[PDB]
Design a protein around this nucleic acid. Structure first.
Ligand SMILES: [Mg+2]
Ligand SMILES: [Mg+2]
Ligand SMILES: [Mg+2]
Ligand SMILES: [Mg+2]
Ligand SMILES: [Mg+2]
Ligand SMILES: [Mg+2]
Ligand SMILES: [Mg+2]
Ligand SMILES: [Mg+2]
Ligand SMILES: [Mg+2]
Ligand SMILES: [Mg+2]
Ligand SMILES: [Mg+2]
Ligand SMILES: [Mg+2]
Ligand SMILES: [Mg+2]
Ligand SMILES: [Mg+2]
Ligand SMILES: [Mg+2]
Ligand SMILES: [Mg+2]
Ligand SMILES: [Mg+2]
Ligand SMILES: [Mg+2]
Ligand SMILES: [Mg+2]
Ligand SMILES: [Mg+2]
Ligand SMILES: [Mg+2]
Ligand SMILES: [Mg+2]
Ligand SMILES: [Mg+2]
Ligand SMILES: [Mg+2]
Lengths: 126, 151, 100, 115, 99, 82
RNA sequence: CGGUCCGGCCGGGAACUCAAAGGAGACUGCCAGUGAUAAACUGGAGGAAGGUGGGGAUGACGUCAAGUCAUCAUGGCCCUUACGACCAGGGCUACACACGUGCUACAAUGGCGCAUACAAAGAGAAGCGACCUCGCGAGAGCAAGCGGACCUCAUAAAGUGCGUCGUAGUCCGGAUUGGAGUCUGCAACUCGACUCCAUGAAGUCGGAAUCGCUAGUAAUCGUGGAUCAGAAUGCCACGGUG
């Protein structure tokens, strides 16, 4: 018996599995410190496990593919905040109050014609 | 903007400590989006300062920013046929936004060998009321009393 | 373009595709490794006597309708303007105006 | 310190220090210190003396300060004194390798120079 | 097994052309493996419009080659024959492939 | 430079002409409209005349020139100075 | 689940990411308040998305006799041993100077050397050309694989860790010049890109005046494509940090 999530940040797709346990964190068969560089990424990957009091009770299996180093952090954040709504469901009001259920609908914005970047003009003379 | 009165946006907290004050300060140290080296330089200098002052690591910062928050400053009007400066008071947010910007504008003008040292010096000096930060503060804070006849 | 240029192209392509047997049996002897170093000097003097236009480098893709040399596209076969005038009428299949 | 014609500074490392000669960069500067059995983060100071006694043997099998400058300023004068196109671009003082000179020939033409 | 590609430009004309193959295999026998939606190459093109001098005015067109693929597991004689009986409307390409 | 393993370039109409003109000796200046040939060592001591864009320019070829191609003694566009 | 060379590889499985067809979804629809009882607007509840959710596509009547007769078609006019047509070699690339647009820097938030992770969107038969060997390196040698979610191009770089460096025209910066080479190509002299060995200029943040940007935005980082036998620091695309 285990519960499941799925989250999408910028260009990533996390995939999270929750079991009751002691606190193990495995990502692509790596321990949590072996994958991520910065302590803010280790913060944001953990954040909703700290928010509710469920660090100790549960272990989790995580697979993530494609994206950047923030994409595969916000993706797992959205993944766990989905996957804990299939655990007790009265976590939902406080996760929503905390602002973790909303999937960020931001994405890279394309380059148009005659614009040297997405909105940067070229220069100007008279 | 002309019409839409708009909101000051949210921010992540700091990685290490837990204060949303430092979230602007790690951002103002930055060039070209690399927030990691900005997160590293600041958490080195906020240990070197925390050793040199003998205070706690979070508490060596606010009581050196206190000496560089202003209280009033000028803007410009020209209502009639004459430019006036005007001493207006400053808002509680732009207070800190000016404070954390003067320090970093100063700390890229020293002669040391590293950014950590250039910011630890610049915080110890503005913790002892000397330096290119509080001298700029004296200039801004004196252009109110040189213009209090305008209001 | 002018009415002579397209005649020059349909005179060039015939030679360049007719002599295609000899200019893959001179470059073989030239750019080989173990061949004769005194036949590699006659197979380089034949290559300047096969006629100059017979060469698949010496021809720009003219348009299939007008004759405009610049602004080609290889896939359609028509120029920069005569792809617009067909694709905004309907003669090229699947060619809807893109946005995304 | 005095190695192969002119002196070499001592405070710099061996690899960065040997480039002070005219005619060694960071390829021959590792060729010498790997064909003479020396490390690469010891200085000219705190070496020994026989190490210099064999380093001076290793360096002078190339062409160095005298020979390089005489050969280069031999070949330049030879290219001048025929009528070669590199010769005319030498003896006019204009770029030689086919640069655009409607603007921006400044490294050959010296300074910016009004009429 | 016997696999067939379907390429087209229009997904109201690829779907009838593949339902008239699944309802040929499932009328001469059985064991078709459905249509499987492969990737869709979008060959973009970007041209100018103005005949002389306007580098900041462009039209952008695309071509979206729709793929499909259909497998056939256990073929009889009439199962392979009633497929090569079948032609399809123009716009759709096929390429039969045993294995 | 060329690839070496193709050997040097020379036209046939100048190679056969120069092997005839050595073995007939005359220093009547040999003219050519082929300014792309690598000058060969048995062309040492000849008066040829390469095209430049307008007319031939005469070139008396010595030992020193034999690496180069025949263009580099015909400067192409005239220049005097502003 | 079971074997497992600890490589979803191999029996298997249809769950899941994902690939695509058809649908559900957002309407100021809902609770409150200001309103001229209406039009609306301000907050907040539910929701993944709040008021046009974020971008694109679409440019009214018309204007400056705007821009090209040199894409093509054209009304009149001018030429017809020439203003037509074939060929070799030159020319658009010259340079005393001025202006406009971009790239690389002037360095410690950074040079160099070693190890180490995470992308997206494209392209390919006269084509993309992995493996293996020779070469210090561009690349030649041999010959599988692929009309491609199969095979290639293809390694992402910024980053993270450990060193070295110590404010110098510098191990900063790569301009310019010499010697030796590789490839496509009938042919790189005027004129090709690229790699190695040398050379190491000008420049320490830039005058008056001016330019772009309101959130995945500006700022930096790499990759692909079109045109193309070879040849863009521009053009058009997509993502990474933010
Ligand atoms: Mg101007
Ligand atoms: Mg302009
Ligand atoms: Mg605005
Ligand atoms: Mg061409
Ligand atoms: Mg040197
Ligand atoms: Mg070098
Ligand atoms: Mg432009
Ligand atoms: Mg609310
Ligand atoms: Mg709301
Ligand atoms: Mg006009
Ligand atoms: Mg005209
Ligand atoms: Mg016509
Ligand atoms: Mg011609
Ligand atoms: Mg031009
Ligand atoms: Mg200027
Ligand atoms: Mg370094
Ligand atoms: Mg290609
Ligand atoms: Mg090898
Ligand atoms: Mg350097
Ligand atoms: Mg070199
Ligand atoms: Mg200087
Ligand atoms: Mg300095
Ligand atoms: Mg190309
Ligand atoms: Mg971007």
């Amino acid at each position: 018996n285990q519960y499941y999530g799925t989250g999408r940040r910028k260009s990533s797709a996390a995939r999270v599995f929750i079991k009751p346990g002691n606190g193990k964190i495995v990502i692509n068969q790596r321990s949590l410190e072996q994958y991520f560089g910065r302590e803010t990424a280790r913060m944001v990957v953990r954040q909703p496990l700290e928010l509710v009091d469920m660090v100790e009770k549960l272990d989790l299996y995580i697979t993530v593919k494609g994206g950047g180093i923030s994409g595969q952090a916000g993706a797992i954040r959205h993944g766990i905040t989905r996957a804990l709504m299939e655990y007790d469901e009265s976590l939902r009001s406080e996760l929503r109050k905390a602002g973790f259920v909303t999937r960020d609908a931001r994405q890279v914005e394309r380059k148009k014609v005659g614009l040297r970047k997405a909105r940067r003009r070229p220069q100007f003379s008279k | 903007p002309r019409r839409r009165v708009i909101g000051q946006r949210k921010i992540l907290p700091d990685p290490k400590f837990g204060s949303e004050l430092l979230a602007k300060f790690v951002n103002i140290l930055m060039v070209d989006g690399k927030k990691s080296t900005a997160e590293s330089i600041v958490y080195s200098a906020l240990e070197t300062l925390a050793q040199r002052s003998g205070k706690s690591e979070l508490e060596a910062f606010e009581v050196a920013l206190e000496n560089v928050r202003p209280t009033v400053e000028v803007k410009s009007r020209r209502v009639g046929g004459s430019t006036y400066q005007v001493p207006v008071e400053v808002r509680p947010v732009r207070r800190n936004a000016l404070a954390m910007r003067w320090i970093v504008e100063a700390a890229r003008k020293r002669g040391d060998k590293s950014m950590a040292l250039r910011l630890a010096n610049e915080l110890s000096d503005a913790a002892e009321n000397k330096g290119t930060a509080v001298k700029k503060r004296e200039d801004v804070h004196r252009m109110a009393e040189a213009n209090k006849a305008f209001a | 373009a002018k009415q002579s240029m397209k005649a020059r192209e349909v005179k060039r392509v015939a030679l360049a595709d007719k002599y295609f047997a000899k200019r893959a049996e001179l470059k073989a002897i030239i750019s080989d490794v173990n061949a004769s170093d005194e036949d590699r000097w006659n197979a380089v003097l034949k290559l300047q006597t096969l006629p100059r236009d017979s060469s698949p480098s010496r021809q720009r893709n003219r348009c299939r309708q007008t004759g405009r040399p610049h602004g080609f596209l290889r896939k359609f076969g028509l120029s920069r303007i005569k792809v617009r005038e067909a694709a905004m009428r309907g003669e090229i299949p699947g060619l809807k105006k893109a946005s995304w | 310190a005095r190695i192969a014609g002119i002196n070499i500074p001592d405070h710099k490392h061996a690899v960065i220090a040997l480039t002070s000669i005219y005619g060694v960069g960071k390829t021959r500067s590792k060729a010498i210190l790997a064909a003479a059995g020396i490390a690469e983060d010891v200085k000219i100071s705190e070496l020994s003396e026989g190490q210099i006694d064999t380093l001076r043997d290793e360096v002078a099998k190339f062409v160095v300060e005298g020979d390089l400058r005489r050969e280069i300023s031999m070949s330049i004068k030879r290219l001048m004194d025929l009528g070669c196109y590199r010769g005319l671009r030498h003896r006019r003082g204009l770029p030689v390798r086919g640069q655009r000179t409607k603007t921006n020939a400044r490294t050959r033409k010296g300074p910016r120079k009004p009429i | 097994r016997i696999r067939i590609r379907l390429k087209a430009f229009d997904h109201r004309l690829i779907d009838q052309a593949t339902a008239e193959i699944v309802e040929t295999a499932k009328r001469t026998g059985a064991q078709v493996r459905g249509p499987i939606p492969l990737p869709t190459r979008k060959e973009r093109f970007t041209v100018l419009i103005s005949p002389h001098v306007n580098k900041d005015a462009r039209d952008q067109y695309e071509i979206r080659t729709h793929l499909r693929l259909v497998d056939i597991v256990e073929p009889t004689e009439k199962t392979v024959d009633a497929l090569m009986r079948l032609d399809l409307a123009a716009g759709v390409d096929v390429q039969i492939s045993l294995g | 430079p060329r690839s070496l393993k193709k050997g040097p370039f020379i036209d046939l109409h100048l190679l056969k002409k120069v092997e005839k003109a050595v073995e007939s000796g005359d220093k009547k200046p040999l003219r050519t409209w082929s300014r792309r040939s690598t000058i060969f060592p048995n062309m040492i001591g000849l008066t040829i005349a390469v095209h430049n864009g307008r007319q031939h320019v005469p070139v008396f070829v010595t030992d020193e020139m034999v690496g180069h191609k025949l263009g580099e003694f015909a400067p192409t566009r005239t220049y005097r100075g502003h």
